[PDB]
Write a protein that binds this ligand. Structure first.
Ligand SMILES: CCCCCCCCCCCCCCCCCC(=O)OC[C@H](COP(=O)([O-])OCC(O)COP(=O)([O-])OC[C@@H](COC(=O)CCCCCCCCCCCCCCCCC)OC(=O)CCCCCCCCCCCCCCCCC)OC(=O)CCCCCCCCCCCCCCCCC
Ligand SMILES: CCCCCCCCCCCCCCCCCC(=O)OC[C@H](COP(=O)([O-])OCC[N+](C)(C)C)OC(=O)CCCCCCCCCCCCCCCCC
Ligand SMILES: CCCCCCCCCCCCCCCCCC(=O)OC[C@H](COP(=O)([O-])OCC[N+](C)(C)C)OC(=O)CCCCCCCCCCCCCCCCC
Ligand SMILES: CCCCCCCCCCCCCCCCCC(=O)OC[C@H](COP(=O)(O)OCCN)OC(=O)CCCCCCCCCCCCCCCCC
Ligand SMILES: CCCCCCCCCCCCCCCCCC(=O)OC[C@H](COP(=O)(O)OCCN)OC(=O)CCCCCCCCCCCCCCCCC
Ligand SMILES: CCCCCCCCCCCCCCCCCC(=O)OC[C@H](COP(=O)(O)OCCN)OC(=O)CCCCCCCCCCCCCCCCC
Ligand code: HEC
Ligand code: HEC
Ligand code: HEM
Ligand code: HEM
Ligand code: HEM
Ligand code: HEM
Ligand code: FES
Lengths: 55, 146, 284, 17, 295, 19, 284, 285
């Protein structure tokens, strides 16, 4: 009975739509490529550098 | 989503922050000395003040002495102001006699404003001075999801 | 102007608003929405073209470098370029489906006389605008298309006199012709939008879903009851196109018709004449 | 601008040492 | 509507019968992590590829359209990239558009915002230095048969002899992946040529794989941006699929509800003539019909 | 090109040897 | 739009042609033709601006060199630039004379209120277009004007955020700003032409030569009996202005206004002349 | 009057106080071809070693003051490098020094403005493109060239490495005096005095400018032709407009008495208004 409150309701529905379609795909995409990260590459590089230094 | 893209195209984006960090040493600088250099293409002044001059009446505590970092330029019109010429009469250019009062007190004469401050910090005991422009947020700051 | 009897509908803001607020649409199917699909993709094309034009400097020696620079330093320039290309593809598909549907429905009577000439004129203007953009692409294919258009235009004058110079200059993609063709592309695109709007306002006289009269007198109001169906059908069409493209165009591919676009005018003065291939809509 | 109709339009012929 | 496979024209595209084209994609499947489902680039692979390019490939080729800072946040950090790029020098004559910004007048160390220029000042100088042929720019090398596979196949594939009737002149080498099977590039990748920073063993296939990954990463519409866009495509597809039922509800169910009418016809014999039917009627196109039609 | 807003727009600070 | 009752006239081509064919004007004099003078100089400005736009690359580091090169390699580019500048001058002079004449005649009445608001709106759009054109020059004066406009925008938005970025990116003349402002100049100039046509349609309701009524009921036809007078009066004004400029702007001239336009935004950065000087129309 | 920007330097000698004569600024004058030729010679020998003209090409002075082959040889005596190019668009493929051509821009021997400043002790030799916007216009070059005779006043304190010049801003310039007697060797045998060299180089530099230069005298002649055409068209416009209106206003009116007994039922119950839709429902109710 309050049209602007109903518009807020529609905005909430759009928010739910976006987050439902956004969160799971991003989660699985990030979980699939954990081993392909710059942090992993830098870890390997630092380990090799330490080995070569104390060689 | 479409409106977000349209507005973001017009507002632009800052991909990353350029590096302007630079270090200088003033450990061998005698007290009461001025030094002019160029940082990021602009002439700047490094001064090692003393307690006697400070009491004479923004500020770095490089040991016993005090150090001030400013950008060497005349604000009303382009200059390389000459320091140490008359103390309170120092900080004067050829075009006008409006001095810069040896400090950031600004108002001395026809020249308007004072030498802009430079973001800096002395991180050794009194010797190493780091300087770099102030950092501001530029969100979104994530370029890659994965 | 004594041979003119006037306009079927005088184009005024208040009258447009009133007409679109009390306009009614009869019950129909998905085969009779290609016109509104074309309107949607035309509006999207206008917006994406404005976004792209805020970054294209009309200099043939700077266009590829500027396009590369704007991609990495902005978030949506390449998205808008992709939108603009896919909108061209969708425009061609929808316009050809619309024309085929009219031909099958045999809309060749005096009451459909008005809606035919305007549509054909709109189609010609659309093809001209597409050609202008393709030339603006500034590759070897752009040069070939410009040369072909210049030769066909000169054939009208039988090769005597340089009557083409005001638009094509020396039949190459230099700065003057690039500026002229870019500005012409923009202006003619907006004129295209206006002409399409006129043609689409000329629809209500004889609007039918099928070739068979249904005899129904009640019809739905356009603003919500028909606009929602139009948007949903557009979504379904986009979904089908996405499925077909995903399962038909693997990446990377062995060969493509777009490998002829590698050559940049100026930078590469050697042209691979064997693999000359346009886009699919000029392939016929 | 050296890439003009009155100038060298597309540098088909280039200035080389 | 059907095309042969033994004529060298893949899927009806003609013009590439003079080279091997389908090995990477159609005849055999070369695996690249960034082109799989929900896959992305390998940061270490791109890092090693840039190392290979900087140490060997960059001495002849260039990527004029692109700058070194493409590798930020995915392959290198700002400081390490700064030193690595500073290992090379640039000149004012290198600049494609040397406006007032570039005020230098001699060589200087390169910075990460500089365009990746070859050591030569001009394409003609490159041709003169390389025996008449120009080392191709890598800015748009994606438009080659099998793209990233094209780069890998060209880097490898120096292991064949020309057939009878084909002659290989001096300064040229036989490579089935290059156009006309005659290339001006001597074999570059040899075993152990580049010492990797991460300690990965350096073989010819490994270096070719890494450099192909790096070059593809630098590309547009197929590099450093495609995987996230495919994820976005998946999200939008999910949204459309989930919104389909509500669209059906609204449109089709509403129409079916609106069409549930009741109709009744009755006999009217009250002695009133249908003068409104005989003497009624309007037509908006009367201004067109009048004076011309049916007179 | 370096004249853009996200680049070194008006070249107020030049790239040079200085010294 | 229940609060809207329509428009005074329709802008249809046939309606406009018939209206201007049947239009009749009463007997007038020189002080009642500044509107037509403004119309004619707007048409000239449109043509000259199009000829100028076919040569301006929107790169700020190329604009001065392109301007210099186009002058020597063509025959009329500098002539069209001169026409554009003098047309701006004459537009300001004619518009202010017209406004002063209306204020003197005391036309702030209800029966010509409609002809007033449209005129003021066209004038404000004229100011905006002039500002954009001034910015397009890519000199130190252009930079100063851009900084002033951006600072006014920021003060209007209270100096919080960067709401000016979409139009004035960094308050400085980079290529991103130049492209947008040039395209805005072009489109808003054409919109100015349309608004001027609207105002010229809204004039005939209460048209008087002088404040005092003349009881004459016979009027001349506009097409030739009044257009000839308008063209002749324009020739009169042009001759008078030529005489004045010859007797008031000799060559060579020392110590002039145009000495702040020497520096370029990119070429000259170590020099900024403190004593700024705008054109005579933004001087107030 | 009222130009308060410039207060120190001398400005009005060329034009206001004194009347310097330049043939291109006479009523029906034009450039002197020999003067422009000698001016380009002077610029090539001395001036072009520091200043340059970025926006201008050498193929100026063609069909007037020079011929194609002689200009080609004279500019081929000069040198140019790819580092000089403001914008190389794949045309300039040379990777080393080469001889200049008439279609080349007039670059200084320096690669960059900062290089010029470093060579010239921190001051940049100003580009001669758009140098017409200096006090006096064409007279600025002549005054600066001949302004090394006067002495500074008391307490002037001319800095080391600078020189005194009345016409330069702040009275102090960083250019040593360049024009001396017999510095150049004119091809046509004209004596080489300091005023003569200054006159020639000023003529050439002013000839190189855009709005005032090679095109201006023809523009003035065109203005004269158009003014004469307007003067000649004055009588016929008067005839048509004013005479036609006077002829049309030669009416005769007659008003008679009508007493036939018919009421003015058309004055009453009459009248149509184009803005009736604007007045209705709003005004006078
Ligand atoms: C540059 C020149 C621009 C045109 C100047 C001009 O109006 O010349 C025609 C004007 C005579 O034309 P006109 O048609 O007879 O005008 C008289 C009105 O009809 C008489 O009827 P009115 O009472 O409506 O007008 C009186 C008054 C009304 O004045 C206004 O309405 C002022 C508004 C601006 C009008 C234009 C002013 C231009 C100069 C500033 O007009 C004038 O004073 C016009 C002359 C202004 C000279 C300054 O020329 C002169 O008066 C000669 C110059 C002044 C005497 C020396
Ligand atoms: C239509 C076919 C193509 C679909 C994809 C086209 C691109 C995205 C859609 C908008 C058009 C392009 C505008 C340009 C700017 C895009 C900005 C953008 O998307 O940013 C990423 C935005 C914001 O992401 P962000 O804020 O995390 O930033 C992105 C960061 N990087 C750069 C690292 C990727 O995210 C998404 O769009 C997520 C996917 C969609 C989420 C749900 C949307 C609504 C769900 C209901 C849909 C119902 C049906 C709709 C009709 C379509 C049916 C097929
Ligand atoms: C500029 C024109 C402004 C205008 O007409 O406003 C009145 C118009 C109304 O025009 P109207 O008076 O023709 O509308 C009649 C009412 N309806 C809409 C049901 C037909 O807009 C408003 O009054 C809306 C105010 C803002 C409400 C939120 C809008 C979000 C989008
Ligand atoms: C979490 C959901 C994962 C997707 C749904 C389940 C798929 C299971 C089988 C599978 O792995 O399918 C992979 C396939 C794409 O794989 P592939 O074809 O090899 O690579 C693209 C090149 N054609 O995947 C597909 O073909 C699906 C592509 C669309 C995305 C999923 C949509 C699901 C419905 C919403
Ligand atoms: C469409 C044509 C008109 C567009 C007008 C601008 C709309 C967006 C806006 O206000 O942008 C201004 C500013 C942008 O902020 P930002 O992107 O960080 O700055 C650019 C730095 N490269 O954004 C801001 O200053 C943010 C202000 C608050 C935004 C949230 C909504 C409340 C205000 C409205
Ligand atoms: C004001 C009063 C006007 C009164 C009405 C007209 C009265 C009758 C006049 C008829 C005679 C006019 C003769 C003008 C001759 C002239 O100046 O020609 C200029 C020239 C064309 O002459 P042509 O021989 O073809 O070219 C020689 C090549 N250098 O080149 C051109 O014409 C090029 C034109 C380029 C576009 C126009 C640029 C401005 C030209 C006019 C300058 C004066 C403008 C005055 C204000 C308007
Ligand atoms: C200098 C000796 C070179 C080095 C080091 C590398 N390349 Fe090269 N390459 C060079 C030339 C002179 C040519 C042209 C041959 C011709 O006959 O045109 C090439 C060619 C290529 C190609 C072919 C591209 C094409 O236009 O089809 C590729 C894919 C290529 N080169 C790749 C490549 C890589 C990956 C390198 C690093 C290992 C590399 N080249 C080094 C000269 C030289
Ligand atoms: C190198 C030694 C030079 C030669 C040869 C010439 N000029 Fe020069 N000029 C030079 C410098 C370093 C400067 C800058 C001085 C400053 O303080 O800014 C100048 C300046 C001028 C000017 C003043 C321009 C201005 O700032 O508006 C003029 C008019 C000028 N020079 C003229 C000129 C002529 C005519 C020459 C040929 C004889 C000439 N200069 C040679 C350095 C050098
Ligand atoms: C419906 C109308 C339009 C059509 C049919 C159209 C068509 C095209 C086509 C076919 C291309 C070439 C893209 C390719 O390579 O395949 C193109 C590019 C382009 N169009 Fe449009 N266009 C339209 C509207 C516009 C508008 C309104 C603008 C500007 C406001 C515009 C500006 C551009 C620009 C700048 C490019 C080049 C982009 C680039 O090279 O990166 N277009 N257009
Ligand atoms: C190829 C040339 C074209 C011809 C000959 C043509 C002809 C027609 C005809 C005869 C109709 C009436 C259909 C009926 O009676 O049921 C029609 C409808 C329509 N046309 Fe076209 N047309 C053409 C192209 C276009 C284009 C390019 C557009 C888009 C701008 C367009 C937009 C429309 C629209 C919106 C309708 C109303 C139907 C609907 O909204 O779904 N037409 N056209
Ligand atoms: C067809 C429409 C128009 C186009 C395409 C157009 C285009 C241009 C261009 C390209 C310039 C820059 C020329 C140069 O710097 O070499 C310019 C300058 C200018 N335009 Fe326009 N213009 C148009 C109409 C107008 C109108 C109606 C006005 C209003 C009086 C106007 C006012 C200006 C001004 C003041 C300048 C700056 C000239 C100066 O002061 O040096 N333009 N225009
Ligand atoms: C922007 C340029 C303008 C143009 C092209 C223009 C055009 C015209 C024209 C053609 C007329 C008829 C009389 C004549 O020929 O002079 C006229 C009259 C008039 N204009 Fe404007 N006008 C402009 C600006 C303005 C402005 C800023 C105002 C201020 C409100 C204004 C208010 C009037 C009034 C009150 C009349 C008298 C109406 C009449 O006597 O019929 N005009 N204008
Ligand atoms: S110039 Fe420095 S005191 Fe003003």
């Amino acid at each position: 009975y309050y049209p602007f409150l109903w518009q807020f309701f529609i905005l909430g529905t759009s928010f739910v739509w976006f987050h439902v379609c956004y969160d799971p795909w991003l989660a699985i995409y990030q979980a699939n490529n954990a081993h392909r990260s710059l942090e992993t590459a830098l870890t390997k590089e630092k380990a090799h550098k330490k080995k070569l230094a104390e060689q | 989503l479409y409106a977000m893209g349209v507005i973001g195209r017009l507002n632009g984006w800052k991909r990353y922050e350029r590096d302007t960090y630079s270090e200088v040493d003033i450990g061998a600088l005698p007290p009461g000395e001025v030094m002019q250099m160029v940082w990021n293409g602009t002439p700047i002044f490094i001064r090692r003040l003393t307690s006697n001059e400070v009491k004479e009446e923004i500020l770095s505590d490089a040991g016993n002495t005090k150090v001030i970092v400013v950008s060497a330029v005349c604000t009303h019109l382009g200059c390389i102001p000459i320091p140490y010429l008359g103390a309170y009469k120092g900080y004067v250019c050829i075009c006008h006699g409006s001095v810069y009062d040896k400090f950031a007190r600004v108002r001395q004469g026809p020249a308007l404003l004072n030498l802009p401050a430079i973001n800096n910090s002395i991180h050794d005991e009194g010797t190493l001075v780091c300087m770099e422009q102030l950092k501001f947020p530029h969100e979104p700051s994530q370029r890659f999801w994965a | 102007m004594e041979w003119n009897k006037g306009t079927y509908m005088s184009t005024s803001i208040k009258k447009i608003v009133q007409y679109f607020s009390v306009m009614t649409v009869s019950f129909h199917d998905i085969n009779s929405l290609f016109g509104f699909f074309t309107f949607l993709t035309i509006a999207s094309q206008l917006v994406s073209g404005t976004m792209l034009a805020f970054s294209l400097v009309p200099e043939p020696m700077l266009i590829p470098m500027v396009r590369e620079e704007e991609d990495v330093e902005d978030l949506y320039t390449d998205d808008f370029f992709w939108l603009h290309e896919r909108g061209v593809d969708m425009l061609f598909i929808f316009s050809y489906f619309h024309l085929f549907r009219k031909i099958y429905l045999n809309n060749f009577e005096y009451e459909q006389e008005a809606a035919w000439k305007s549509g054909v004129f709109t189609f010609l203007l659309f093809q001209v605008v597409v050609f202008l953009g393709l030339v603006l692409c500034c590759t070897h294919l752009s040069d070939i298309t410009l040369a072909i258009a210049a030769n066909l235009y000169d054939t009208f004058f039988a090769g005597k006199g340089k009557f083409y110079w005001w638009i094509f200059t020396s039949k190459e993609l230099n700065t003057d012709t690039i500026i002229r063709l870019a500005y012409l592309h923009y202006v003619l695109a907006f004129f295209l939008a206006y002409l399409g709007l006129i043609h689409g306002v000329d629809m209500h006289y004889d609007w039918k879903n099928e070739s068979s009269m249904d005899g129904l007198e009640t019809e739905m109001i356009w603003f919500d009851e028909a606009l929602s169906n139009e948007l949903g059908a557009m979504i379904e069409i986009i979904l089908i196109v996405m499925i077909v493209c995903f399962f038909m165009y693997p990446e990377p591919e062995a060969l493509s018709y777009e490998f002829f676009m590698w050559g940049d005018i100026g930078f590469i003065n050697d042209v691979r004449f064997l693999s000359v291939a346009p886009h699919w809509y000029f392939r016929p | 601008a050296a890439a003009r109709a009155y100038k060298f339009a597309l540098a088909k012929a280039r200035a080389a040492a | 509507f059907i095309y042969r496979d033994d004529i060298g024209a893949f899927w009806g595209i003609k013009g590439y019968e003079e080279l091997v084209t389908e090995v990477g994609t159609h005849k055999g499947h070369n695996y690249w992590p960034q082109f799989s489902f929900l896959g992305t680039y390998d940061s270490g692979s791109v890092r090693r590829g840039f190392q290979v390019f900087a140490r060997n490939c960059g001495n002849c080729h260039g990527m004029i359209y692109k700058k070194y800072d493409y590798l930020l946040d995915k392959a290198y950090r700002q400081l390490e990239l700064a030193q690595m790029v500073s290992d090379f020098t640039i000149h004012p004559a290198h600049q494609h558009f040397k406006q007032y910004y570039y005020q230098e007048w001699d060589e200087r160390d390169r910075v990460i915002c500089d365009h990746i220029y070859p050591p030569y000042f001009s394409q003609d100088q490159a041709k003169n230095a390389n025996g008449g042929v120009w080392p191709t720019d890598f800015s748009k090398i994606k438009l080659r048969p099998g793209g990233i596979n094209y780069i890998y196949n060209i880097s490898t594939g120096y292991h064949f002899t020309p057939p009878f009737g084909m002659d290989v002149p001096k300064g040229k080498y036989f490579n089935p992946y290059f156009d006309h099977m005659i290339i001006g590039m001597p074999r570059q990748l040899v075993d152990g040529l580049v010492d990797y920073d991460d300690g990965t063993p350096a073989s010819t296939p490994q270096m070719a794989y890494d450099v192909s990954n790096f070059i593809n990463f630098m590309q547009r519409r197929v590099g450093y941006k495609r995987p996230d866009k495919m994820v976005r495509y998946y999200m939008v597809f999910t949204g459309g699929l989930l919104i389909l039922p509500f669209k059906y509800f609204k449109t089709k169910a509403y129409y079916r509800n609106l069409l549930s009418l009741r109709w009744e016809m009755y006999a009217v014999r009250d002695g009133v003539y249908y003068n409104h039917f005989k003497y009624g009627g309007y037509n908006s196109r009367a201004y067109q019909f009048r004076g011309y039609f049916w007179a | 090109m370096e004249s853009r807003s996200y680049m070194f727009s008006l070249a107020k600070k030049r790239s040079t040897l200085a010294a």
